Amino acid sequence: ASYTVKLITPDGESSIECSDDTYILDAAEEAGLDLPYSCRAGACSTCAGKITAGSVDQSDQSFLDDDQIEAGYVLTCVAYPTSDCTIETHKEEDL
Numbered sequence: 100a101s102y103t104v105k106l107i108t109p110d111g112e113s114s115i116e117c118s119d120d121t122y123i124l125d126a127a128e129e130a131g132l133d134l135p136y137s138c139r140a141g142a143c144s145t146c147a148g149k150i151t152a153g154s155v156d157q158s159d160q161s162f163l164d165d166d167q168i169e170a171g172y173v174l175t176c177v178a179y180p181t182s183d184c185t186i187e188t189h190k191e192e193d194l
């Protein structure tokens with residue numbers, strides 16, 4: 100399956116198509132957007148986003164604690180979409 104991912108950045112709002120087996124960051128880069136990252140391995144907060152609608156599979160994330168997850172934080176570099184979703188990007192500073 101493929102999902103529509105709406106991305107709300109500090110510049111504005113976009114929507115990209117992202118397969119269920121593509122990470123959200125990778126999908127965003129393919130489209131041509133410039134979202135933040137460092138490790139690309141789920142071990143930092145560089146790529147942090149906040150999901151407001153929809154769901155992901157971020158099973159390989161290892162940086163966010165349970166409360167940060169509850170609040171909607173996602174590590175876009177290891178997050179696959181599992182539905183159409185909306186993710187506010189550039190959220191590291193929240194952490």
Ligand code: FES
Pocket residue numbers: 135136137138139140141142143144145146147162174175176177
């Ligand atoms: S860039 Fe480090 S967790 Fe995504």
